Ligand binder design. Structure first.
Ligand code: SF4
Ligand code: SF4
Ligand code: FES
Ligand code: FES
Ligand SMILES: [Fe+3]
Ligand SMILES: [Fe+3]
Lengths: 633, 633
C-alpha cells in the first residue's frame, strides 16, 4: 500500500477497501496498464473524424497525421487545448464569483455581502475604479463589471493580467503579443487555431498557449480577489488535517470541489443547525474539507482538511462520511458509485456539474441558506441511518498552521519592519539565510506514490534554506505530512531558514517559528504567490525572471495544473513538473518549452520525474538566479 | 484510384502524384491503418495527466477511466469538446467579420464598405436597432456591436439564435435551458464541464452540447450576415468547377480557407493587376477557389471552383498552381511540404493560422489592397519561374449554376407568386411535386471514396422528387459531378421535381429549369438554409420539427461539421451523418443522439455509413414528416 500512498491513513483505508471489495482509483489505474504510449507522449490526434492519427515515438510509419500534421504540430495542439481547458476551469470559477458579488450588492442574494471592504478598495484602486465619495455597493458593482468585462474583447486588454504584474513584465509580454485580449476570447481562439486545417506551426501554436495561460492566471487572480471580497482575506489559522479529523459521533460533512460560494454558507449554516444535530444523536455537525474548496474554508475558517485529490475516495471508506457536498473540478465521479457501498450521501450542487447516481440540490445564491439546511438535513438523516454501525476512522492527523495570504505574509514581516515589510525577507535572501523561494502547486497523480514527490523535494529545499510556499493539493500533501506544524521546524529547516522563521514568529507574539511551509491557499490562490513575487520584484526594481523564485507542480494531474505551470513559465519562473506532460513525442516542442522559451519570457519548464534529481535541478535554477543578481550561493 | 476518389480529375492527379513520389492524404491514411479502435468509438480520454484512459468496446478490463469516468461520460465529453471546437471556428470567422465591418464604418479600412445596404437594414430590424433617421455607418456600427456582444453574457441571450428561429422553436429550446447565453461563454463552459472531475452525467453533458451547437449556429448566421453586408448577398451566377478551370497560360491563384475578408479583395485587385500579368508572359490572373472561401467568391463573383476538401493537394500536383492564398480552417498542412515539389507559392495570411515552411504575409484590413498586390506579385513571380515547363491540368470541368442565397430563392419563387413567394414551394410540397427538402452539408472524408456518399444519396432523393440544397464541400462534391448543371435535370430529377424546377426557371427568363441542386454557399451559409426553413415554418404556422426537411453530413470530417450536425438536430431536423462519429462505444449516448433527443428538440441523428441505406432512411424521415402533416406520400 506504500507504493500507492505515502499517507498512513490512506494506506489503512486501502486495506479496508481491498477487503470489502470496493474498487479504488489505484485499482482502476492498475486495470489500465499498460497505458497507450502514443497518447502518453502526445503523439495522438482526434481533432477530426479522419482520425485517430497516432505516430509512433520511434520506428516506421505512421510518421505524420492524415492531413499532414507533423509530430510537433500534433503535440503543440494537444497542449494548447489542455491549457485552454484549465483556463476555462479557473475562469468559470472566477466568473461565478463575479456574478455572486454583483447579485450580493444588487440586493438579490442577502446571504452574500462585502466582507473585506479594505480588499474591495485596494482592488478598485489597482483597476482604476473611483473610491472617493462612492458607496461600497457602487464600487463593488464596478469591480464585478470589470471582472466580467475581462472575459471578452474591449478597448483594454485583460486587466487581471496587466494590473497585477510589474510594468516591465507586461512590456516583455506585449512585445511578443502574449497579453490576453479577453479570457473566453483566448479559450475560443485556442480551440479554433488547434482545430483541423488551422495553425500548423509549433512556435506559433505555443505562443498562443502562453497567452492563453495568462488568461488562466487572470481567472485565478480574479477568483482570489472576488472570494476575498466576499468571504474575507485569510489570516493565520490553526487546525488539523487527514482522516482523523472525522469524528464517529458527529454528522461528518465533507465540502469538496473548488468554488466556496456554497461551502462558505455550509460552514456558517452548519453552526446554527447544531441542536438539530444533537436532537438526532450526534454531537454536532463536523464540517471537513476535501480538495480546494476544503482549502478555501480551511484558509478562512480553520475547517480541518480531511484529505485531497487522488485519495478522496478514502474519506468515504471510513464509513463515517455522512455527506459529500460537491461543486465542480477534481471530483472523482467514482464517489457516486462508492456511496452505495459506504452509506455516504453524495450531493451535487452545480448545474453544469452532475454525476449520475448522486442527489442533486439546485443551489442558487438567492436561496443559499435554505439550500444549505436542506443539504445538511440530508447529512443528519444519513447519520441517523448509521447510528450503531462501526466505523473505521484512522486515528491519524497532523497539526496545520495556515492562512498565509500575501497580506498575511506582509503583515507578519511588518513586525520586523513596519514601513518596509518586504525588506527583512530581501535582506535574508541577500545574506543567504533564505536561499530562494519555491512554490509547490497542483495535484496528486495516481502514477506517483501519493505525496512522494512533494515531500522528497520539500525536504531537500528546506534543508538548503529555501522558503517554501504551497497551494492546492501541494499544500494538502505537505500539510498531511507535518510540514505546516511549527514543532517540525527544527527537524526540517536549515539553520538560516530556521532563524528567519523563528525571527518572524517571535515578532508575531508566537514564541515559536512560522511553520516550515507557508500555506497560501487553493489552486486559484496560486495568484497570491504571484502577488508576493511581483511585490518583491517591484521592491527590488527587477523583473520576475531575475528573482530566485521557482515553482514545482510535483505531481501534476489536471488540465488546470498544466495551465498554471505554463503561466509560471510565462511570467518568468523556472517551473518543475514531476509527471510527464504529453510532449515527449516532439523534441522541437520539448526544446521550446524547456530551453528556448527562456529567451522569450525568462522562465522555462523543468521536466523531471525523479524527485531527488528534481530538487537538485530546482536548487540549480535558484542558485543561477542568485549568481545573476551578484549574490553568493 | 477509383477507391480513393470518384472524381476523374482527382484520379488523374493521383496517378501523377504516385509516379512523382509525392505523398498524398490517401497515402498518409493508408500508412495509418489499422487505426485505433478505442479512439474511433470514442472510448479514449486524455483530459488529465493520469491518462490516456482507453476502454475496450467489448471484453474485459479496462471498463472505466482511472477517475471513475464511465464509457458514456467519456464519449459525451469528447463529443462536447468537438462541438465546442466547431463553434470556436465558425464564431472566430464571424468575429473577424464583425471587427472588419466596425473598422470599415469607422473610417479605418477603406477597402471595405457597406455593399448590401438592404441587408444591413433587414438585419438591424431583425435585431431591434433603429433604422429611421440613422446614417448607414451608424446602423452598421450598432450591428457590429450587437454581433460582438453575442460572444459574452449580457442582459439578453444570443440574438443570432433568438431572432433567427421561430418563437415557438425558441420556446421549446428555452424550456430545456438550451438557449446560449454567449458564444465564447458556451465554448468555455464546455471546456470547463468536460475537464477532469466535473460534469459526469451523459444527459447533462449532451444538453450542454446542444446548447453549444446553437452557439455554433449563431456564429454561422452572424458570419453569413456580416459577409453579405460587407461583400454583397449572392444572386444566381454561372461558372465552372474542377481542375480544368486552371489555365496553363495564366497566373493561377487559388484562394483557400473559409474567411473571404482578404480573398474578396484578391478577386477585385487581381483584375487591376492584369497588365502586370501580361507583361510577365501570362494571359492574366486566373483566380480559382478551394474549399469554402472558394465557395464565397464563387457565390458572389462567379469565381470557378478548382477543387475541395480531401483532394485539395491535387490542384498543386498539376504543376500550374502558382499561388495558394490561405486564411484558416480545413487547410491540409501538407500543402506547405508539397509546394517544394510543385513550385507552388503557399502563403498564409492569418496571425493564428501559420504553417511551417509557408510564406507569411501579415494581412491587415487597413492595408488589404497593398497586401493583395504583394501576394499577387509573388504569384506572378512563380508563373515566371515555370514559363516553359509542362503542366498536367486534366481537361475536366463541369458547368455550375449557383448563388442561391435565401433571398435569391425567394426572389426566384416570387416570379410565380409576387406577394406570397413561399406559397408555390409549399403548394408543390402539399401536392407531392416536392416530396421534401434535403440539405447536404460538410466535408469530404478520406475514409469515404471522395463524393461517393453525396452523389449516391443525391441521386436517389432527386429521383424521389426531393428538393436538394447544398453547402460547403457537399456543394463542392455535387457541383464537380454535374449536379449544378441545368442540362442534367432531365437525367437526375423525378417528374414532379423537374416540373417545379422548370416552372421556376421559365418564370425567371431562363427558358430552362433551375439546376438539379441549389447551391446555398459556404459552411457558415448553412445558416441560409435555416433562414429558408424558418421562413417556411413561419409561413405554415408550425415548428421546424414538423416540416419535411432533413440534413445529411454525408462525408463529415471537421469538428465544424459535428457542430453543424448537432444544431440541425437541435433546431428539429432529422440529420444524417455518413461517417462514424466517436459515439459507438456508448449505447446510452447513441440512444440519446438518435432516439430520445426526439422528445427534446424533435430532431435526431441518423448514423448510416451505407449511402443507399442512408437515402432510404432520409426518405423515410421525410415521409414520416409528410404523414404527420396529413399529406400523401
Ligand atoms: S486533424 Fe489531422 S492529425 Fe488530427 S485527426 Fe484529423 S487528419 Fe488526423
Ligand atoms: S479525466 Fe478521468 S478518464 Fe480522462 S484521462 Fe483523466 S483519469 Fe482518465
Ligand atoms: S492512440 Fe492511444 S491516445 Fe490515441
Ligand atoms: S488509445 Fe487510441 S485514441 Fe487514445
Ligand atoms: Fe484537489
Ligand atoms: Fe472544405
Amino acid at each position: 500500500q506504500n507504493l500507492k500512498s505515502t499517507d498512513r491513513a490512506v494506506q489503512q483505508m486501502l486495506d479496508k477497501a481491498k477487503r470489502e471489495g470496493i474498487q479504488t482509483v489505484w485499482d482502476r489505474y492498475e486495470a489500465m496498464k499498460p497505458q497507450c504510449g502514443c497518447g502518453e507522449t502526445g503523439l495522438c490526434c482526434r481533432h477530426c473524424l479522419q482520425g485517430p492519427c497516432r505516430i509512433n515515438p520511434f520506428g516506421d510509419e505512421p510518421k505524420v497525421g492524415i492531413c499532414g500534421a507533423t509530430a510537433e504540430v500534433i503535440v503543440a495542439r494537444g497542449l494548447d487545448r489542455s491549457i485552454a481547458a484549465g483556463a476555462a476551469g479557473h475562469s468559470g470559477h472566477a466568473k461565478h464569483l463575479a456574478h455572486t458579488l454583483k447579485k450580493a450588492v444588487q440586493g438579490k442574494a442577502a446571504s452574500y455581502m462585502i466582507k473585506d471592504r479594505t480588499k474591495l478598495h485596494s482592488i478598485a484602486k489597482r483597476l482604476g475604479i473611483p473610491t472617493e465619495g462612492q458607496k461600497d455597493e457602487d464600487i463593488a458593482l464596478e469591480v464585478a463589471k470589470a471582472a466580467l468585462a475581462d472575459f471578452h474583447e474591449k478597448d483594454t486588454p485583460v486587466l487581471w493580467v496587466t494590473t497585477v504584474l510589474p510594468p516591465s513584465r507586461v512590456k516583455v509580454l506585449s512585445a511578443h503579443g502574449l497579453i490576453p485580449a479577453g479570457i473566453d476570447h483566448e479559450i475560443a481562439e485556442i480551440m479554433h487555431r488547434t482545430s483541423m486545417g488551422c495553425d500548423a506551426d509549433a512556435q506559433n501554436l505555443l505562443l498562443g498557449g502562453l497567452r492563453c495561460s495568462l488568461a488562466d492566471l487572470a481567472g485565478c487572480y480574479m477568483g482570489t480577489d472576488l472570494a476575498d471580497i466576499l468571504f474575507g482575506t485569510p489570516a493565520p489559522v490553526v487546525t488539523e488535517s487527514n482522516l482523523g479529523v472525522l469524528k464517529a459521533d458527529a454528522v461528518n460533512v465533507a465540502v469538496h470541489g473548488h468554488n466556496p460560494v456554497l461551502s462558505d454558507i455550509i460552514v456558517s449554516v452548519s453552526k446554527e443547525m447544531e441542536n438539530e444535530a444533537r436532537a438526532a444523536g450526534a454531537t454536532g455537525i463536523n464540517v471537513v474539507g476535501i480538495c480546494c474548496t476544503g482549502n478555501e474554508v480551511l484558509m478562512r475558517h480553520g475547517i480541518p482538511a480531511c484529505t485531497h485529490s487522488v485519495s478522496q475516495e478514502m474519506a468515504m471508506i471510513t464509513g463515517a462520511l455522512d455527506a459529500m457536498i460537491l461543486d465542480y473540478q477534481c471530483i472523482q465521479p467514482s464517489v457516486a458509485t462508492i456511496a452505495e457501498c459506504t452509506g455516504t450521501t453524495v450531493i451535487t450542487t452545480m448545474e453544469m456539474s452532475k454525476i449520475t447516481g448522486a442527489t442533486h440540490v439546485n443551489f442558487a445564491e438567492e436561496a443559499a441558506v435554505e439550500n444549505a439546511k436542506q443539504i445538511l438535513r440530508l447529512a443528519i438523516d444519513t447519520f441517523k441511518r448509521r447510528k450503531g454501525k462501526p466505523v473505521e476512522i484512522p486515528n491519524i492527523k497532523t497539526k496545520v498552521v495556515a492562512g498565509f495570504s500575501t497580506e498575511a505574509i506582509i503583515n507578519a514581516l511588518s513586525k520586523l519592519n513596519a514601513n518596509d515589510p518586504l525588506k527583512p525577507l530581501i535582506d535574508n535572501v541577500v545574506n543567504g539565510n533564505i536561499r530562494g523561494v519555491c512554490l509547490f502547486a497542483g495535484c496528486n497523480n495516481v502514477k506517483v506514490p501519493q505525496d512522494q514527490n512533494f515531500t522528497t523535494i520539500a525536504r531537500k529545499l528546506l534543508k538548503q534554506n529555501v522558503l517554501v510556499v504551497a497551494t492546492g493539493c501541494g499544500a494538502g500533501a505537505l500539510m498531511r505530512h507535518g510540514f505546516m506544524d511549527p514543532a517540525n521546524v527544527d527537524e526540517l529547516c536549515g539553520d538560516g531558514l530556521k532563524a528567519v522563521l523563528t525571527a518572524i514568529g517571535e515578532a508575531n507574539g508566537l514564541g515559536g517559528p512560522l511553520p516550515p511551509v507557508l500555506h497560501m491557499g487553493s489552486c486559484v490562490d496560486n495568484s497570491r504567490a504571484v502577488a508576493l513575487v511581483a511585490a518583491l520584484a517591484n521592491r527590488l526594481g527587477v523583473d520576475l525572471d531575475r528573482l530566485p523564485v521557482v515553482a514545482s507542480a510535483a505531481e501534476a494531474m489536471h488540465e488546470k495544473a498544466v495551465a498554471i505551470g505554463t503561466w509560471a513559465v510565462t511570467i518568468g519562473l523556472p517551473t518543475h513538473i514531476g509527471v510527464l506532460p504529453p510532449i515527449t513525442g516532439s523534441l522541437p516542442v520539448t526544446q521550446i518549452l524547456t530551453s528556448s522559451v527562456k529567451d522569450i519570457t525568462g522562465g522555462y519548464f523543468i521536466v523531471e520525474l525523479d524527485p531527488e534529481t528534481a530538487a537538485d535541478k530546482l536548487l540549480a535554477a535558484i542558485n543561477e538566479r542568485r549568481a545573476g543578481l551578484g549574490l553568493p550561493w
